[PDB]
Design an enzyme around this catalytic site. Structure first.
Site, short mmCIF file in Angstrom:
data_model
loop_
_atom_site.label_atom_id
_atom_site.label_comp_id
_atom_site.label_asym_id
_atom_site.label_seq_id
_atom_site.Cartn_x
_atom_site.Cartn_y
_atom_site.Cartn_z
N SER A 45 -9.34 1.32 4.31
CA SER A 45 -9.56 0.00 3.48
C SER A 45 -11.03 -0.42 3.71
O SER A 45 -11.41 -1.31 2.72
CB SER A 45 -8.75 -1.00 3.99
OG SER A 45 -7.21 -0.70 3.20
N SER A 105 -6.54 -6.95 2.22
CA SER A 105 -6.49 -5.63 2.26
C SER A 105 -5.25 -5.24 1.33
O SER A 105 -4.51 -4.05 1.76
CB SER A 105 -6.29 -5.12 3.68
OG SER A 105 -6.83 -3.64 3.85
B1 2GK Z 1 -6.33 0.06 3.92
O1 2GK Z 1 -6.51 1.37 2.77
O2 2GK Z 1 -6.91 0.81 5.17
C1 2GK Z 1 -5.02 -0.13 4.10
C2 2GK Z 1 -4.35 -1.16 4.96
C3 2GK Z 1 -5.16 -2.06 5.67
C4 2GK Z 1 -6.14 -1.99 6.50
C5 2GK Z 1 -6.55 -3.22 7.27
O3 2GK Z 1 -7.31 -2.88 7.98
O4 2GK Z 1 -5.94 -4.14 7.35
C6 2GK Z 1 -2.97 -1.24 4.98
C7 2GK Z 1 -2.03 -2.13 5.96
C8 2GK Z 1 -0.74 -1.94 5.61
C9 2GK Z 1 -0.45 -0.71 5.20
C10 2GK Z 1 -0.87 0.04 4.27
C11 2GK Z 1 -2.41 -0.20 4.47
S1 2GK Z 1 -3.39 1.00 3.87
#
Ligand code: 2GK
Length: 263
Positions: A45, A105
């Site tokens: 993210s 996010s």
């Molecule tokens: B991102 O593509 O890294 C995603 C995030 C959130 C990242 C963060 O550091 O908060 C989530 C959170 C929950 C489910 C899936 C994803 S992908």
């Protein structure tokens, strides 16, 4: 050469069992402190910053772009959509999508930013336009989080992301109004207190964007305003050898603490 700070980071990495990437730019003197600074890491993210910034750039030649409605359909919901799910069968503006992506996010929000830019390559193209030859976005949410070791898709290096974050938030990659909007969004992040921020003196202020994925990938990129001195840019990337590894935000906090104590 290996500095005392680099040695401390290597010790942290060894104890963690994973692979750690760090890049600091101190804007007081423009000096850099790198650990695996030129190795690739899955962004997860943290790539939302580049997408939001690319849309901000587009808005420089379209005063109303950020107020443009985007339809949110049931089929658009992915795996994590805390804001977008409230607006299914309705609309969100590109500003609302940018805020949701950055501050919560929200993955559906990210996919709308990507679509506005014409696909993942639109985000890469913006990176190239601002001098980042390293960043690549290849996929949408959620598959951009597969984080498979050795896979170049959806990766960057700590050095490249630190340079780019500096140009976006402190430099002139964006117009003044847009740079300010980006900084405002990052400063209002809700997800960052356990990561880089946890390793910094409490008096300091910061904006950040976290990331997490498979292989226990745990990331954070931050712009930091330390008490009584010029801002810092810090990126901390961490990834692990097993696909189902647990998140290690504490490792990012530890890296940030080592960096802060080395100033
Ligand atoms: B991102 O593509 O890294 C995603 C995030 C959130 C990242 C963060 O550091 O908060 C989530 C959170 C929950 C489910 C899936 C994803 S992908």
């Amino acid at each position: 050469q290996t500095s005392a700070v680099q040695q401390k980071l290597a010790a942290l990495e060894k104890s963690s069992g994973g692979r750690l990437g760090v890049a600091l730019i101190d804007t007081a003197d423009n000096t850099q402190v790198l650990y695996r600074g030129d190795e690739r890491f899955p962004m997860c993210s943290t790539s939302k910053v580049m997408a939001a910034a690319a849309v901000l750039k587009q808005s420089e030649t379209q005063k109303q772009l950020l107020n443009q409605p985007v339809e949110i359909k049931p089929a658009d919901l992915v795996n994590y959509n805390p804001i977008a799910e409230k607006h299914v069968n309705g609309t969100m503006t590109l500003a609302e999508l940018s805020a949701a992506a950055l501050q919560y996010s929200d993955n559906t929000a990210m996919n709308k930013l990507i679509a506005q830019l014409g696909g993942p390559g639109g985000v890469t193209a913006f990176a190239r336009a601002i001098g980042d030859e390293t960043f690549r976005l290849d996929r949408t949410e959620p598959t951009l989080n597969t984080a498979i070791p050795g896979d170049p898709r959806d990766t960057t290096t700590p050095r490249a992301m630190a340079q780019t974050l500096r140009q976006l938030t402190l430099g002139h990659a964006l117009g003044e109004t847009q740079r300010a909007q980006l900084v405002t969004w990052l400063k209002g992040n809700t997800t960052g207190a356990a990561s880089i921020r946890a390793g910094l003196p409490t008096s300091w202020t910061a904006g950040d964007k976290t990331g997490s994925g498979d292989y226990g990938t745990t990331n954070d990129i931050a712009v930091i305003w330390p008490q009584g001195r010029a801002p810092l840019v810090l990126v901390t990337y961490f990834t692990q050898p097993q696909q189902n590894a647990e998140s290690r935000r504490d490792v990012l906090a530890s890296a940030a603490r080592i960096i802060a104590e080395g100033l």
